[PDB]
Amino acid sequence: PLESQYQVGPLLGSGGFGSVYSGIRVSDNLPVAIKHVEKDRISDWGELPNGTRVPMEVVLLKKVSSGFSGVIRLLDWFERPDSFVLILERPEPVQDLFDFITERGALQEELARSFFWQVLEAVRHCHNCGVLHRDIKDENILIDLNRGELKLIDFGSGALLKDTVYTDFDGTRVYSPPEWIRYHRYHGRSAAVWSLGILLYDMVCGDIPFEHDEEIIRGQVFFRQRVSSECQHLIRWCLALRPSDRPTFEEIQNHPWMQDVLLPQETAEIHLHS
Ligand SMILES: O=C(O)/C=C/c1ccncc1
Questions:
Q1: Which residues in this protein are found as Phosphoserine?
Q2: Claim to verify: residue 226 and residue 161 sit in the same structural domain
């Protein structure tokens, strides 16, 4: 069973992740996303509770699979001779944060607060399940427009979470920390916080703060839009040059700028026009 089980639709995305199609589960007309990954382009693999050799991506997705709606749910997968096919949940209507920001410019702080908070809950969920996403960015975040709920997608650059140093990286350079640029070394959590600082800046300014390696290393933050003093403080904190000067997830969520977040649904009512 595979072709009879899913009705394949139009292509959604095409990148370093691969080829993702809109789909419909023939069983109950459920909206799905059908992701194809070529074996030759897969650089690291693991194994399941019993399992054969599957892509790390599948390992990581199964580990964060649950009722929690903050991380994309892997519903099924198939192995073909030269590829793996991932059946993922698809919200509907949906828009990714990159497209959302492109369309609307810098986000109001209240909306950025709601979105960032949900990103924080989702990443914490990953870390708790032993999974490090390592490609946190606007493109890897879907917005369920009706419910006001965000979903982390694309675990294709991820790894098991560990407390020892990482010497490999294949996420997005412009979201990577100065210790990666300068040394090819990072730790998971502190590097995740850095990329979260980039994302937050992206939300409130409508573009990322650094384009080139030298800017990343210099770590000097210029605000191109009006941003409140506390948000600027949180952003600069996440983007501290020294990894150990960065806030913990707890400190991020305790920060004064993070107080009084909207519920996702209150968020959709106010900012998503539902
Ligand atoms: O996990 C991914 O790489 C992509 C997931 C996804 C889910 C719904 N729509 C588009 C992409």
A1: 66, 229
A2: yes
Experimental approach: X-ray
Classify residue 52 by burial, with Cβ atoms within 10 Å: 0-12, 13-18, 19+.
exposed
What does 194-232 look like in DSSP terms, one character per residue?
A: HHHHHHHHHHHHSS-S--SHHHHHH-----SS---HHHH
Mutate to test the pocket of ligand 1, among 19, 25, 58, 88 (most ligand atoms within 8 A of CB): 88
Which bin fits 154, alpha (ψ -120 to 50), beta or left (φ > 0)? left
Quote the number of domains for the chain. 2
| 22 and 39 assigned to the same domain | yes
Domain end position, chosen among 92, 116, 149: 92
Mutate to test the pocket of ligand 1, among 14, 96, 153, 172 (most ligand atoms within 8 A of CB): 153
Helix (H) / strand (E) element for 24: namely strand 18-25
| CA separation for the pair 156, 37 (Å, rounded) | 9
The residues that bridge with 55 in the sheet, in sequence order, are 45
Q: Which residues pair with 19 in a beta bridge?
A: 14, 36
Judge whether 207 counts as a catalytic residue: no
Nearest CA to ligand 1 atom 1: 154
CATH code of 61's domain: 3.30.200.20
Listed resolution, Å: 2.2
